[PDB]
Amino acid sequence: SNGYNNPNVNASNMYGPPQNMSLPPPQTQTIQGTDQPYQYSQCTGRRKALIIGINYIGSKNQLRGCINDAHNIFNFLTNGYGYSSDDIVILTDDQNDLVRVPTRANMIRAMQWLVKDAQPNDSLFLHYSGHGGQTDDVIYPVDFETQGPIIDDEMHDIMVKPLQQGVRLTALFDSCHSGTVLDLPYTYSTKGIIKEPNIFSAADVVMLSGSKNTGAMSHAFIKVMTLQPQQSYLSLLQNMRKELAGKYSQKPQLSSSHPIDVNLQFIM
Numbered sequence: 348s349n350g351y352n353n354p355n356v357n358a359s360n361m362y363g364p365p366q367n368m369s370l371p372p373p374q375t376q377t378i379q380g381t382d383q384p385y386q387y388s389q390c391t392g393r394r395k396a397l398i399i400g401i402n403y404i405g406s407k408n409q410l411r412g413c414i415n416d417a418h419n420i421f422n423f424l425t426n427g428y429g430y431s432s433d434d435i436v437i438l439t440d441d442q443n444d445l446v447r448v449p450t451r452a453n454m455i456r457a458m459q460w461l462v463k464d465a466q467p468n469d470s471l472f473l474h475y476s477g478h479g480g481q482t483d484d485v486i487y488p489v490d491f492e493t494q495g496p497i498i499d500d501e502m503h504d505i506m507v508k509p510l511q512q513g514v515r516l517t518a519l520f521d522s523c524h525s526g527t528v529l530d531l532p533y534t535y536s537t538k539g540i541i542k543e544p545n546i547f548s549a550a551d552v553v554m555l556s557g558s559k560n561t562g563a564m565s566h567a568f569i570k571v572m573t574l575q576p577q578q579s580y581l582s583l584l585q586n587m588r589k590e591l592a593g594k595y596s597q598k599p600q601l602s603s604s605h606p607i608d609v610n611l612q613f614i615m
């Protein structure tokens with residue numbers, strides 16, 4: 348009998364969250380044996396999103412569905428989750444406004460914009476679909492041939508390092524080899540903790556990515572949250588894995604800047 352690993356199946360044929368699921372606690376949390384507080388966001392504040400989809404149109408490794416992944420996430424967030432269009436920057440390489448092209452400079456600037464002046468209980472969302480690689484994990488702006496990639500340490504320095512206690516950053520990567528792209532120290536799978544520090548931000552950073560067309564992670568995330576919006580961190584992972592099974596060769600993982608009580612409700 349294992350309700351962690353073997354959850355019951357509900358009327359929608361999906362894995363059920365815990366019978367009694369709590370919202371993340373408002374109080375400052377601490378880690379035992381050290382002085383490193385953190386705080387879950389209540390997500391009652393400002394909601395902003397940066398969404399990036401790159402197809403590398405015209406190049407030798409043009410991709411087919413990344414721009415579409417970006418549009419899917421834009422639609423999902425604006426229509427479901429209170430992200431206003433004035434509060435979203437979407438960068439894609441098939442449209443006609445240069446300042447919205449995902450060049451390296453525009454991406455870096457947008458990353459700075461996303462987290463600028465972020466207050467406790469704000470909810471920030473980052474989505475990336477394009478080429479990913481490991482050298483460090485890195486991502487590839489449309490002009491990477493001349494400007495190079497953006498590496499994990501820089502993305503951590505721009506988007507994680509400045510965050511105040513209790514600011515949520517939720518990140519969703521559809522790219523390959525992006526599991527450590529924000530240098531986060533905790534990693535969770537459907538089967539439990541798979542990485543944690545052996546001994547830190549006080550913010551609330553969580554990220555979803557896949558490990559071994561269209562974006563598998565955004566596909567799974569959007570379908571699960573559309574059909575059954577009530578999920579814990581763990582049941583969200585389990586249900587995404589269930590949706591991906593057979594069709595996709597990817598399994599979802601959750602990384603975080605702090606320990607997660609995976610039975611808490613996943614909110615945004």
Ligand SMILES: CC(O)(c1ccccc1)c1ccccc1
Pocket residue numbers: 439440441442443444445448489
């Ligand atoms: C998206 C766009 O095709 C582009 C520009 C630069 C690199 C890749 C793609 C564009 C946008 C505005 C003006 C010119 C070209």
